[PDB]
Symmetry: D2
């Protein structure tokens, strides 16, 4: 019953989180750990960073790892993942792709791959965030009248874009729940004489500082009451957890392109 899993970018912060997750999962075993060709770390035990001698040495031999693994979990770089994709296809590996920054042709390449292998690709592998979108969708219909909708988001001192993509996705989900679009009703920050708030407005506030990983709150502010739905990310560790649920979903599947909506039965 036990998933034979390889992890890509095994020396990276994400790869290390994925390794600790695989080791801890009772229904998975770590059988491969890849790092780039020429990495100083090649030859080290995958678990050396933690307490453990896993007996799995970091290697750059993509072919052997794909031969020996049934699953590869990959949160690295688009061109790196595409190299892994070709091996995954020839070796019939089930693939969980948490990498980001693909072009449209590359994304379509991943879908095409889904005709031959089973894979999950998602921009957000978090159980929490994906469920929160569905919660927001129900809340936006139930609170469609009498509630002013505000989206408040906090991230670290280096985030260059306001509001975050997650906040924007949340806004779109909320707008669509009543057949609207965001750019009709979105207000981004407020300064000066902003006047009476229009009841249809979706107001965004973007807080920035420290090393905050990402907090997102949707506030439904009514007359005499408030309802808040908040997601707090403490670290990329939550992506490792969703990646394993993705692997468990893929265990039942022969071929197909899937996202986290499929994995979580949300769609």
């Amino acid at each position: 019953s036990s998933m034979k899993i390889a992890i890509a970018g095994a020396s990276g912060r994400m790869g290390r989180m994925l390794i600790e997750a695989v080791l801890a999962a009772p229904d998975a075993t770590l059988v491969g750990a890849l790092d780039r060709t020429g990495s100083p770390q090649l030859g080290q035990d995958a678990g050396a960073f933690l307490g453990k001698q896993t007996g799995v040495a970091l290697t750059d031999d993509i072919e052997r790892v794909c031969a020996e693994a049934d699953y590869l979990i990959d949160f690295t770089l688009p061109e790196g993942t595409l190299v892994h994709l070709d091996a995954a296809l020839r070796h019939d590996v089930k693939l969980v792709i948490g990498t980001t920054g693909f072009s449209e042709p590359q994304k379509a390449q991943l879908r095409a791959a889904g005709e031959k292998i089973a894979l999950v690709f998602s921009a957000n592998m978090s159980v929490g965030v994906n469920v929160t979108m569905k919660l927001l969708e129900f809340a936006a219909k139930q609170f469609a009248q009498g509630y002013d909708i505000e989206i408040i988001e906090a991230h670290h001192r280096h985030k260059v874009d306001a509001p975050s993509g997650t906040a924007l996705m949340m806004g779109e989900t909320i707008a669509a729940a009543t057949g609207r679009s965001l750019d009709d009703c979105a207000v981004y920050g407020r300064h000066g004489v902003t006047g009476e708030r229009d009841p249809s407005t979706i107001g965004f506030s973007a807080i920035r500082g420290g090393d905050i990983v990402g907090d997102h709150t949707v506030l439904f502010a009514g007359i005499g009451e408030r309802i808040e739905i908040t997601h707090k990310s403490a670290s990329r560790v939550s992506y490792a957890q969703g990646a394993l649920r993705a692997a468990r979903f893929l265990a039942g599947r022969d071929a197909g392109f899937f996202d986290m909506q499929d994995v979580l039965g949300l769609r």
Copy 2:
């Protein structure tokens, strides 16, 4: 076409909020303002406290009010409310009852044979909707999330945790066919050890004049999801009462609660 609404206990704190909500609702008109025989406000314009003139004078005349109104919204006392019910029964009034609570509940379910009424102890849109949000969230986070319910109330609240927090617990427990009696931990203290993943832990904060905050925390590996309801005051029940009246506009007779009102059951 606008709902012709009367308000009971009209010079009281809750009555005033109801009057405010009826005037502000663009589909409701105030036609009656009922108060006790012993009220010092009889004869005054229902809106005077707002500096408005409504054409509606506070009266103790239960009969005239019920004859003249299509709806009566009543958040008063059981005795006065049951007197109001008999008059509603005779005049075919759609009744919205925010009173709490009495044995007595039987008589007003029995009234639903002849008139349309809504009764609920919690007439807030927010709390009722939140209950259904928890049901979905409990199923979706059934694995990997430690569930904690945190509730805050005023310095005079005698019971912990709140009945609302308990309802949240039961809803959550039930969403996976469970009972709260199997998994509840209330106000932990001392050496409690490794938290069991199935536990629902309750925390009860007491102080000041906090009207009532309720948070359900789903605490997972690397992340947390929180669903919070904050009550600022009884004004939210006045908003819910108006939705109750709107629902009742379509109904001939029957006993209903906020679930029916909001289309949730």
Copy 3:
């Protein structure tokens, strides 16, 4: 020995809260309840709305009230308040003024030559104390902490950020000899780039009937420290007014604010 206190605008929302606070304070006694000539409540017991009998009947008689009271607490309108001030000047009343605001401030600083009075737009213990907490925190977190001020108010609030949030910013800026005009960023949106460590960023949330929440976040590497003030209603100003009266008990004449009252400057 208990403070002999009169309340202005006694049948209004704020007047009622003041009456409540005076009765509840174990060192204060209600001796006067003043209202407008045009009030429909004259003659009624000041406590009737509470189901209490105080021995104090609502009157428009400014002269008698000031003659009979040692203190007058007044949160009404400038015109009525300035009429109240002249009577306080003639009867040596200790005046607590929550009214806002008028040009007019000059006359009531000038009144401090002859009587003892407190004037403040923000009569809350919590907000004034929080201001001094921020001063200490800004100095201690002067290096390594990004400072963000987050404020929430109701759907009708026209200005952003709130004046309170601005005062918090200025206090923080000043704690390191700085100006807010040098470092403030209000409502960021779009590509804003690397946050400058000196920036004080303001966020303004608007919706519902939120009375006013203000949070100062100190966001550091691995940790955050938050200092938050939440106003539920004007009842907190009634509490502050009573502390103002207590402070005034010791004073012969003089113009004072909440800083003096709470011993903060």
Copy 4:
């Protein structure tokens, strides 16, 4: 002007955070990295976990590291730290000790050491927490009447003790600010008919779940208003930051036993 710093337990999670902090600090250089004798990791570059070849190899030679370093930062184990202490004394090293679980004789050993070397020892190296205690002290005097004081604390699913030591320290600080003691006024959790709240009570609530590192809130609940002072720890990274401020304080000191109150000028 640049502090020559060695880090103990260089393969541990804390040691790794301390290494990244030293590397990033503009006024410090990493000159030594210690790990236990027999560690598999001996010989590796201290920065291999990050992107960087620091040229500092992990070693178990305590003598050489203390000879070459001016500062040693040590968040390891009490018996390990005591071995380091003796080297620190013979080599005149400035010591920052973040280790915990010492006995009273051992603590007194650290103080005695302070006659010969300059050192910082503290149970909490966080700037945030230490400043928060002082904030709480001022707030407790200002809010001494009319405010119900509640302490709410959240930690991970494995914390066995409720409330946390930090919460208890917060309670004691608050009680002392009006000449009281905690065990006279503390109420720990609430269940059942608890009755009218006594205005002097300090009520504690302990929330448990997930991997929450530690949130602490003091609530001053008044009539018509609330004042909250909250400290959120995201990770042990904040201890690394306070350890460096400790090193900077120690740069000016020849000998002496110091804690974070000294380091931050709070006392």
